[PDB]
């Protein structure tokens, strides 16, 4: 897979993320973590207070498609930031070899 081919799949996966985000807002319930697109994959609805695990997306060629990326959803319904930094916490170490 080439670089430009990989970018096209990311744009496709980004479009389906906007659909899943526009639809969940059209059918609301409770206070969960809302779907987000972090330029790699589309994080789904997260249960408050739990770690959210997503399979490493198969449209990324260099990913280990048998692993999982992880996020933290707090009981308030917002994705947890990294301690000491203003960035959303995410662990992609299972997906790549250089981590």
């Amino acid at each position: 897979m080439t670089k430009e081919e990989q970018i096209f799949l990311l744009h496709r996966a980004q479009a389906q993320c906007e659909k899943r985000l526009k639809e969940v807002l059209q059918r609301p319930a409770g206070r969960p973590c809302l779907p987000e697109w972090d330029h790699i994959l589309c994080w789904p609805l997260g249960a408050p207070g739990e770690v959210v695990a997503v399979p490493c997306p198969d449209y990324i060629y260099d990913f280990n498609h048998k692993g999982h990326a992880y996020r933290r959803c707090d009981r308030n319904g917002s994705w947890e930031l990294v301690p000491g930094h203003n960035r959303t916490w995410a662990n992609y170490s299972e997906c790549v070899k250089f981590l």
Binding site: M1, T2, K3, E4, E5, Q6, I7, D38, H39, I40, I60, Y61, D62, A69, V82, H85, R87, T88, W89, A90, N91, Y92, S93, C95, V96, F98, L99
Partner: peptide, 21 residues
């Protein structure tokens, strides 16, 4: 694009994987 695709992913993961841990 053999290394161009991989080096492009380096940037995504660099600023993606925010757990400095």
């Amino acid at each position: 694009q053999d290394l161009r695709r991989r080096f492009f992913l380096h940037h995504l993961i660099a600023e993606w994987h925010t757990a400095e841990i």
